[PDB]
Design a protein around this ligand. Structure first.
Ligand code: PLP
Ligand code: PLP
Ligand code: PLP
Ligand code: CL
Ligand code: CL
Ligand code: CL
Lengths: 502, 502, 502
């Protein structure tokens, strides 16, 4: 399943996971279960509870924390309350009841877009990790969704439905990008045309100015990028972000930006395009990778309250405004005041079902607890732990290839590129590396590792020339498995060197 | 929020919830958390775990159950294992690891449609509650989705995409139905035409043969019904099910049926249209109402392995088959073998994202635990408890209107119709009831209750004549609130009688 | 072993068992162990105790119950004391010491026939479950034996020894009966002649009046029947019991009746022939099936204090009375006052060993605890639980054969008859069922299930015509195993229908 996921979906699945916010969730659940039972009125039954009451919830919660000081999840829950009440200044009783009611999953999400306090908490996390601090928190709204996967499906459908993207429109795509994102515009369902914004291996996988300038073409309605990138696993540098900023400000104030920033926390000092061009950007952030929460399906779509999506909607042709008046008629009297972010919500479940739309309340609670976990960790201990783990696995991989590729300030390294030439160069000089590349390819490299270790790697391209290389995730295997990849690739190189000399 | 949900979405939200399977979930979570920590290799860190190991899981689980015999959730978990292993004959280690891995939400759902053992467990529950026992379990497949809400959105979109429903096609809709289901075909996005299959108040809200025969019109491609009904809250009787069966067998073997059977468990001896016409029916079942789990967003789409949806797909015009070959190309070599149920899955997240599609693994685990809860309860104690609760609230409501409407074998009563004429008839004779109806309407009835009690009711129509009536849910309020509705409606009747006499 | 038991012994072995009276037994054992240690006088030894003292036993027992309120077995023991003392009016100290001394197995059973208080307790259970309430409790005596198996061996041997049954005497046997009971009279050791009292499939396996009238033949000395029957699994109806009653009263006051009523508790409102003709009947009751206690070997022989066995003994020819005077000489001065029930006891172990004869004291204690368990359960919860379990397994079996045979008021259903004709009739009409029977037999039916499922069934006959049928026990398998039998038998029927049509 780990090997099959990389081939099919270009992921990625970590073998680590955040335990403390998970324990806090299950412990909160036991508290909420007791809260439900406090509202059950009848004798001689079993298995039926009532709704949790907001009245006196703080005092009951405080007792629960005091009696269970020995439980890690409970201590976390205790500090979470302080963080929300004391640092965020939010209503403590309202926070607790939203969490209790939320984890019970006994009420339809209200509002459907996101639960009130969860939105306020999660956006603090999002703003911080995206480097978007210069934007007032109150100007950022979130739509809680079933991972980045759901976000992308919802966004393209709403773009189509609301006439923001039309058949024949050009979508610029920062490349190399993983397979799934190439196909969605290529669907006849959308019939969009791709323009490649190509990263340069000579610039260490940054986008050249010349490539970024392609965005000046007014036929290009949207810039779509994974940042930090996947496969290449680098973050857009200061120059690149500035270039986009100037292009938007100077030439294309109408350019929509769709940015997928799931790997952000794995970079040093990450800054999102959302931070740089908030009015022009829809941010997709997934909790999957950082918290080891792929199965939880936790994501948000973020939008600035003043954005070009709502501006474009006000500039639509009359026939389209009339069609949308009909579409959203049941939702509100004035459809023209219905914002794009809330249209995403309505479009996600056929409009008529808007009031039972949204991410499940226990999922939002869990998302909120992951968010708190990271926010309360001021010295970034969890982040550093994961980074040290990733570096250890890297050292182990390149042990006999030695050693790892040199990493700059823009490095992410969730993924690593094992380049045959660079490896054979490090081992046996420049002359040998030129020859070794002409002998074997990516196929012979990936098939050998697979046969020796049972691990299949991603080809390392490209698009390029088929420079013989493979990509491994530093997130999904254990040390001896990275050591076995290195050993198999070292024997392959050693046998090439014995076929070099003689 | 309770009053606002009935007006907007025609629900419904229960104030009861199943506690035991929820406690089992949170307890399983604590076990899984410990399982994750067993795979963590490093010192001097906190909050990071590894992946749960299948090896020796039974023995560890058995210890967990033995040490926590005093915990209700744990005892349930213990019996669940026996039920799965002993009664269902499934692999106990594989069940446990699916549940442990599932609740950790650390792996993408695999397969995306449903987790393997969860599917087998949940379909046992579905088949039993739908009265579909005559169908072999192995011939029923499920797609786990975000409630009935997601199911409906997914189904219509896939119908459109795969050319099973086309603009101008007629959709027959069993009525009265709640608002949301009237609007989805009416969307320009689908441009479908509605044909009303009208329930008869004289038949106690059953569909007359003459109304059911409307399905013979070959322009009608789908029969769409909520069964048991909402608002009317009755199940289709033996005659009605037989009529549809003959119509499908005799005249319309091509008729698709879409049935929403969320209220099934609240009827006595429920039998689904899925049981009667499995080859022709897509079953939508929601866990929301029965388990008090609206916020969990838990539903399945059920299909027979041999169905008319796949048959129609094989009979599509060549241009459509060519378009679908392109659409699903990345999924499998032979797109023509891709079944409609799996197309729902692929269509739910844009095709290219099929391998990260599906309901979150902790949601499927919770769904599995609700399913087990009901399956293991042989004497149906929970079902009876809820029914007694509903009846008590009914008795309390009609206490001063006295007494409740007579209920037949097809009665559900999650909702109750408070008919002014019938109430005033029971109180002051037939002559007075005829006059009292001409004086006040549904509006004056609903506005009075709202002003006196703060509870807003649904109008009781119709479509009919505006016979002055209101609908209350027996699931969402407490006893004194039902008593206050009765009292307000009794004083209204008493003041009408003092304006009658004089 | 489960499959091998049905073929060899015509059983039957349940996969359920009564746990509470078993836990009570083991808990009582720990109390008794401590009682023994209270009588041990010496230092510096281990593993040796003394005899439990009756003095102060109530107070010590009451402390034991109070300290162990959390133990299910102990709570049962506590309520047992109340039942014996308060409802039965028996000596509480004497009850406790009999139980304590009994479970220690440190004294020879005294008296050998049954322990005093155990007899009083167990007969209350027997009288109730046999519907024999009209008989005063004090007029019923029991001989505790090693299951019904030992009872039958003991009874025939004593019948022979005491000249109540002689070579060439006719034994009437209610049939169909299971194999073991056909062979015991056929032994040259007894040389008895069988007369078949045949049950009628047209009467749903009741004995016709014409068949019951066969008992008028004065050459028939004993009527031997399993009631409720095995294999057929029905109880004798009101008419049948009345017929025997009149035959005994009117024509055959000398007719001995031997009735085996092990399945009694699985019928609704069971009434034994012992209840109807107590003076003429020896009742054999086994605890094996109802309590899931086959390995415990627990049975009683019941006799009325005024019976025709003792009457016949007084009418024996002088040469036989002289021989029996010699045989029983050591037992009592007046052998002619030695009752048949006590002769069973003496005959069971060669007469000279009468005073070390009888069922082991821990077995009698366990029997007493099973008896209490059922007596104290006023709402018959355990009985209903087992019946619901049996019905669930039946529903699961006939799921695809659908559905189960219609059951009347005389139904027991521990066993179920799977009739090919009736099954194929229910599925494909009367015409097909006539043909399907001519194609395959019982052999082809039983061998197919065995090969597909690994379960071997009993042939369903007869004696009859070999109507193609099989018998399954609803007591010995789990749900998926019944489901696999149904599925194998459905595919067999479906392939017959494809060989019917074409
Ligand atoms: C892993 C990954 C995601 C996260 O997907 P979810 O559906 O949120 O789990 C998003 N984008 C990219 C490019 C990824 O590699
Ligand atoms: C409540 C209800 C449902 C359940 O909705 P979910 O989205 O599954 O919570 C489905 N159909 C009808 C008609 C209802 O009233
Ligand atoms: C099972 C059974 C018994 C019980 O036998 P024990 O020796 O008491 O276990 C007695 N009679 C019949 C006909 C049976 O099937
Ligand atoms: Cl914890
Ligand atoms: Cl618990
Ligand atoms: Cl115990």
């Amino acid at each position: 399943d780990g090997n099959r996921l990389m081939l099919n979906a270009g992921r990625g699945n970590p073998n680590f996971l955040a335990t403390t916010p998970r324990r806090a969730f299950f412990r909160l659940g036991l508290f909420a279960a007791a809260e439900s039972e406090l509202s059950y009125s009848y004798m001689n039954t079993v298995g039926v509870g009532g709704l949790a009451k907001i009245e006196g919830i703080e005092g009951r919660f405080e007792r629960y924390i005091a009696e269970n000081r020995d439980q890690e999840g409970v201590r976390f829950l205790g500090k979470s309350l302080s963080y929300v009440r004391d640092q965020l200044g939010l209503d403590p009783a309202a926070f607790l009841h939203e969490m209790v009611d939320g984890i019970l999953g006994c009420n339809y999400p209200v509002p459907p877009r996101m639960l009130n306090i969860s939105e306020k908490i999660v956006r603090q996390y999002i703003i911080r990790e995206m480097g978007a601090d210069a934007i007032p928190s109150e100007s950022v709204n979130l739509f809680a969704v079933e991972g980045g996967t759901a976000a992308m499906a919802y966004i393209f459908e709403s773009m189509k439905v609301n006439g923001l993207l039309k058949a024949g429109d050009k979508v610029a795509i920062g490349m190399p990008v993983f397979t799934p994102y190439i196909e969605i515009p290529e669907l006849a369902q959308y019939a969009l045309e791709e323009v490649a914004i190509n990263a340069d291996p000579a610039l260490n996988w940054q986008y050249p100015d010349s490539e970024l300038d392609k965005l000046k073409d007014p036929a290009i309605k949207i810039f779509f990028c994974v940042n930090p990138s996947n496969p290449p696993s680098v973050k857009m540098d200061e120059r690149s972000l500035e270039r986009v900023r100037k292009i938007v400000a100077e030439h294309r104030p109408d350019l929509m930006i769709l940015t997928d920033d799931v790997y952000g926390t794995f970079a040093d000092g990450f800054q999102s395009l959302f931070a740089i061009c908030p009015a022009n950007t829809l941010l997709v952030y997934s909790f999957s990778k950082y918290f080891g929460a792929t199965g939880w399906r936790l994501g948000v779509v973020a939008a600035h309250k003043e954005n070009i999506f709502d501006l474009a909607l006000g500039r639509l042709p009359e026939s389209e405004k009339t069609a949308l008046d009909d579409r959203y008629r049941s939702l509100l009297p004035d459809v023209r005041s219905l914002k794009f972010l809330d249209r995403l919500v309505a479009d996600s479940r056929a409009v008529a079902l808007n009031h039972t739309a949204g991410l499940s309340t226990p999922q939002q609670v869990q998302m909120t607890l992951f968010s708190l976990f990271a926010l309360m960790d001021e010295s970034d201990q969890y982040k550093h732990t994961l980074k040290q783990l990733i570096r250890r696995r890297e050292a182990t991989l390149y042990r006999e290839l030695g050693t790892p590729p040199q990493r700059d300030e823009n490095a992410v390294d969730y993924y690593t590129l094992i380049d045959l030439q660079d490896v054979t160069s490090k081992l046996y000089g420049e002359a040998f590396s030129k020859w070794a590349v002409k002998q074997s390819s990516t196929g012979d490299m990936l098939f050998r590792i697979a046969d020796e270790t049972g691990i299949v790697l991603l080809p390392g391209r490209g698009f390029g020339s088929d420079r013989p290389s493979g990509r491994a995730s530093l997130a999904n295997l254990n040390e001896y498995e990275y050591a076995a990849i290195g050993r198999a690739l070292r024997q392959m190189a050693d046998e090439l060197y014995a076929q070099y000399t003689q």
